Symmetry: C6
Subunit: 221 residues, 6 copies
Amino acid sequence: HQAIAKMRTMIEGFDDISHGGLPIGRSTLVSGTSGTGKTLFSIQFLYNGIIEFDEPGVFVTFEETPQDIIKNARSFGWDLAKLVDEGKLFILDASPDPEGFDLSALIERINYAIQKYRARRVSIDSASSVVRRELFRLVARLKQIGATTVMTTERIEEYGPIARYGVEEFVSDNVVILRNVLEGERRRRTLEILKLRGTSHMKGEYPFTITDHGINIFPLG
Amino acid sequence: QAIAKMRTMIEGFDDISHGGLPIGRSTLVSGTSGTGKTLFSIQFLYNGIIEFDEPGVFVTFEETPQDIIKNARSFGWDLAKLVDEGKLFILDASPDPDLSALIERINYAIQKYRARRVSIDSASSVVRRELFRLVARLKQIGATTVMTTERIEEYGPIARYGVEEFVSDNVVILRNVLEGERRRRTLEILKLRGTSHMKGEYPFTITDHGINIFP
Amino acid sequence: HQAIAKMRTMIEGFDDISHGGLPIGRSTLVSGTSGTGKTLFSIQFLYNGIIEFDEPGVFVTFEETPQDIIKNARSFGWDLAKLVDEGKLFILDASPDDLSALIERINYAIQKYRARRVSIDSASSVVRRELFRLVARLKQIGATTVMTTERIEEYGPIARYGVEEFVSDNVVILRNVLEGERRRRTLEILKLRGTSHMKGEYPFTITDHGINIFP
Amino acid sequence: AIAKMRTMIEGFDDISHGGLPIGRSTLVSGTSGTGKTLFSIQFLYNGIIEFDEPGVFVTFEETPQDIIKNARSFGWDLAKLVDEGKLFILDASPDDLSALIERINYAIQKYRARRVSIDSASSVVRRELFRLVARLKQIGATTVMTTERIEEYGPIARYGVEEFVSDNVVILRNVLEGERRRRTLEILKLRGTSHMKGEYPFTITDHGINIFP
Amino acid sequence: QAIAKMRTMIEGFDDISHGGLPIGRSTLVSGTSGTGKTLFSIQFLYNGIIEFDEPGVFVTFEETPQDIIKNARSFGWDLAKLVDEGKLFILDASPGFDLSALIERINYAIQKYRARRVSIDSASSVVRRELFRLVARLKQIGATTVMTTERIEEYGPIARYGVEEFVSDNVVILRNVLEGERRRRTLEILKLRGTSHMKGEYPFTITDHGINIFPL
Amino acid sequence: SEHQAIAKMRTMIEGFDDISHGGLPIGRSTLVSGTSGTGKTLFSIQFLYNGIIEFDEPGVFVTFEETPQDIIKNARSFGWDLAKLVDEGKLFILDASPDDLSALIERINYAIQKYRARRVSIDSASSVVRRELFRLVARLKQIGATTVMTTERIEEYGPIARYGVEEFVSDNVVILRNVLEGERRRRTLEILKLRGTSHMKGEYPFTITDHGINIFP
Ligand SMILES: Nc1ncnc2c1ncn2[C@@H]1O[C@H](COP(=O)(O)OP(=O)(O)OP(O)(O)=S)[C@@H](O)[C@H]1O
Ligand SMILES: Nc1ncnc2c1ncn2[C@@H]1O[C@H](COP(=O)(O)OP(=O)(O)OP(O)(O)=S)[C@@H](O)[C@H]1O
Ligand SMILES: Nc1ncnc2c1ncn2[C@@H]1O[C@H](COP(=O)(O)OP(=O)(O)OP(O)(O)=S)[C@@H](O)[C@H]1O
Ligand SMILES: Nc1ncnc2c1ncn2[C@@H]1O[C@H](COP(=O)(O)OP(=O)(O)OP(O)(O)=S)[C@@H](O)[C@H]1O
Ligand SMILES: Nc1ncnc2c1ncn2[C@@H]1O[C@H](COP(=O)(O)OP(=O)(O)OP(O)(O)=S)[C@@H](O)[C@H]1O
Ligand SMILES: Nc1ncnc2c1ncn2[C@@H]1O[C@H](COP(=O)(O)OP(=O)(O)OP(O)(O)=S)[C@@H](O)[C@H]1O
Ligand SMILES: [Cl-]
Ligand SMILES: [Cl-]
Ligand SMILES: [Cl-]
Ligand SMILES: [Cl-]
Ligand SMILES: [Cl-]
Ligand SMILES: [Cl-]
Ligand SMILES: [Mg+2]
Ligand SMILES: [Mg+2]
Ligand SMILES: [Mg+2]
Ligand SMILES: [Mg+2]
Ligand SMILES: [Mg+2]
Ligand SMILES: [Mg+2]
């Protein structure tokens, strides 16, 4: 009977901008051009869930190998191997063999892991008619399971389409856009919460930096 | 004997539209993601029920009824209660996790609930033909309808297929323009066939109370 | 210097901009984005001919029903029903629920109703070759014709397929330009073969008396 | 220098440094209502009236009757010129490219014409256009060919090849400045000779095209 | 030894190119209609003959030989005389096309006239392949070649298919841009593999003596 | 510096090791993309040449268009004698230029094993390009090679490479630009991303001279 509740990301600044965190039991699209911090955001969401709340996490990777995910996270001071060893984090490898794709079977394997590891948080990294239907099915199944999910997507322009197929930002309940804008010859990273269905959030772009401690969203407007 | 209007009671809108939405006709409400389309179409029905006891049918193609109900709690509205009382019907035409068939279901619901208001949320040749027929059928039935559509640019095409704004009698455009790192929401009544309305963009906000439009 | 004869539209300001009205016995393309006043222009052309000159007219419609056309015209205080009753106006319904048939139908109505004025509302290679054929036989009848077309940008091609402007004798563009959140309606006579006309855009409004252009 | 024929279109022979190169073809490209047909007609009319140079006008869409009627408002009696055998309007307007070429050739020989106006896949267009230009040359005709374009500052003509195939290229523009239209003419290219460069304003009046260099 | 260059003697160009065109390679010269591509390619051969008694072969696809000759009279160049003397040869390649035959002919002409200089005037995937082949086979002959190509925008892709600038060793862009209602011609050497050149656009005019470029 | 997660090898290209905070990540691939004549080939040759001269690390250069002869001739612009390094067995130029990705990959592997190579330069549907590039990157990684892969782009500001996928499957992305503004060209280099560490951000000016690329951080 209440308006939708939120789970804290504990990503510095983010829970302020979102007025409490990510909407629980829903999926949030996080879209951005190359090297904008999408994998970082997805990982920091699980990592903080484990460390701060003992909420287990599942990370589903479609291209980066688990071993590279674990190695690159040490850049932010995080030991994911340790969390995997303890059974608090599971990295599901859906990356292709370096020798169509069945999202329906993949979903069942994601569910196994969620149940096995008792996970509350899920990150998934990363023809428009077909994209829309398939993305719709995935979002719906995750909701049914009860997971709170970050889903990354790619885009190719800083102030153009939200994602690549012009449908992702309509099927998603929540949309966050990471940008990396070239101003003069300098880059400025910003985060925007474009929409959160059924709840409030701050509007427009907020600058952030990536540091040895992950994402740092500057004190706000 | 010129066309009459039905009040939305959406604060600011009945002013811009000089009395509300043209009765017995369909209004397209187009907008990029998160612009307020669902909210407008829910507030249309909600106010019709609460202010005028005019029952409403909400047709959903993606969002589940459960999520529409949950999301409307953001605004302190209890849509489950209105459904339970028979004032509101949320018609689930979502896909599993035929345009004539859909029309027959909408007609059945309109008769069942004695509804006066409908919201529908949400090749150009085929699209234009199908939309025209949906619009014509709703008119024959007597529905006053809000139909939302998606668009991908704030100052580009009105909707996706470049035809929707031409077969619709009325067109409303919601915008969410990003400038200098800040967003500004606006509402425009682009066209109302056979009647008058204010022109250009009017600022609005979405708060705990729903849509507020400022002239 | 033999002048191309024109017939007065009596649309306020237009006969000034066109130096006497529309070229008689020819077709004028009237193109615009949604809700720019295309149908209004085409109806005002017929209405004024009947009321001012006892020149009967035929309105050919492809999407709006005659009933809605008549209803919307009440916005401007025009009783089109009465004119149809008196055989001064014929609304030809060419709506779905070949071009050859339509043309003979239009020819038939022109002969039957003594009509001098005609309004038609509303792959590029295909459009070009049979838009040209339509112009040719209307000219053969001796009709003076307004034909509306859609376009989707205010400053893009004249009409949707990028050919219509080249096969028409005469071209008029209605714009509804959005700048700084405000809209400005303008009318431009782009071309009138064989005769002079004022150039560029002229602002107009749509009010209770229809189109008012300010030269 | 190469020999040029005077168009006698006010201002144009100055911009082209003496007129159009004889025996060569000139593209005249513009958006709708920019004056392409007018330029075409004036080129023939002046050749006849001033220089007793007969002309052939080839039309693909506008009918001969309309061309004549439309010219009348400039005070030009084309029917009279057709009656005297000084002008031939060749109707190719609708209900073989080689068949048209031999129709043109035949009319040129028959009327002893020195001036021609033709109004109006990339691979095949370029191929078919190059073929047309190539044969007019062999004949010795001096030709104006109009083409359509859809933007004032954009490709020269509809298919992005026309300007590369033609010896000479003239662009007629009709540009919006604020809400006002301004007509200009530009000679982009004239192979083998000098010309004035850039855009020059013109008006269309009761006396045809008037360009101010 | 780094790649050597041969002087074009086109005024200002040898300064911009730091010595002329790289020997034994092809230079792409691209530009919109009427930018001076043919004139650059002719002036290259004409100066070859006049200044260095280096015979030249001009390969034409659009213009007839007769028109090439007539159009150069503008500049006081008597190409008819150069053809009569056997110093210039104009190879007519005007109208299922495939490159392999044309090369024999070019080669034929090159040894026949003892030519040092060549000018060729004028699916992206196939264009890239076929251009690559032409460039390679010309290189095998040892010819120094100017090959012109079209583009449709002053500040867009180097050439028409978006691949020509990548397979060419050297690239020169001629522009004809609107300044007000006036035109400004400029020449840019975009790239010369394995050697140096000045950067950016340099204005030029076309006069009764052909191309005149001002580097300073 | 020390407190970063990913080991790097120095390019010894003036200024680049500063911008990349230590050089190119070892055992990984770096995309180097740029319009025509931006310096892609020079960068990828300079990478190998410096590896050999400074650290006696052998390199393999894979060329898909330029012939070995021309690669060698063009490098003389900079005073580099690549023929001598090829004679000495320190450099191998693999000629894959025209008169099967799997066969190519096996050639590369064979050369890398045969020449004991530590540095590799490769010069130069969307998701068929994507999965083929992905495959290529994965295999070089399993070998342990550190790779520079150049790609083309057609606008200075616009897509990173031709197919809009190359920048997402690469671990590291460098963009070379050659911007024309007010009739003048200025060259810049940008490291857009390096997975797993920091790096200087934005564009940095550079020149190409008789000494190769000189970048000013
Ligand atoms: N209580 C609230 N206070 C302020 N804003 C709110 C509140 N609840 C929701 N919103 C806003 O309403 C937006 C959602 O509005 P919707 O009507 O769902 O938009 P939409 O255009 O239908 O988007 P789709 O269908 O997801 S593309 C959220 O993104 C919030 O910005
Ligand atoms: N009494 C009135 N006062 C002022 N404006 C009016 C009045 N009645 C109608 N209008 C305007 O006229 C417009 C309708 O013009 P139409 O001629 O129907 O446009 P249209 O170009 O034919 O649009 P289509 O066919 O729907 S794309 C409406 O959108 C109103 O803005
Ligand atoms: N007597 C006149 N006085 C002034 N302007 C005139 C006169 N007669 C014609 N015009 C103008 O000339 C224009 C037509 O010129 P054309 O040469 O027919 O144009 P066009 O470029 O051939 O256009 P098309 O073929 O219709 S796309 C008309 O649109 C008028 O603006
Ligand atoms: N004597 C001259 N004085 C000045 N300009 C001249 C002279 N002769 C020719 N021109 C100019 O040179 C231009 C022709 O140059 P070309 O080299 O033929 O151009 P192009 O780039 O090859 O064009 P194409 O192949 O027709 S697209 C003409 O358009 C004139 O502007
Ligand atoms: N000695 C030198 N001094 C200065 N600049 C030079 C020197 N040698 C070469 N250059 C420059 O280096 C550029 C070539 O760089 P490359 O590395 O071949 O470019 P690229 O990006 O690989 O271009 P492609 O493959 O031809 S698209 C030339 O265009 C010259 O500007
Ligand atoms: N310790 C650190 N300090 C500062 N910046 C860092 C640090 N570690 C990594 N980065 C930055 O993080 C970026 C990578 O972030 P990711 O989250 O991998 O981006 P991404 O959007 O997932 O990019 P992809 O998937 O390769 S397209 C690098 O390009 C660096 O700029
Ligand atoms: Cl940062
Ligand atoms: Cl708001
Ligand atoms: Cl108005
Ligand atoms: Cl004028
Ligand atoms: Cl000049
Ligand atoms: Cl430099
Ligand atoms: Mg990532
Ligand atoms: Mg919605
Ligand atoms: Mg209409
Ligand atoms: Mg014409
Ligand atoms: Mg040329
Ligand atoms: Mg290279």
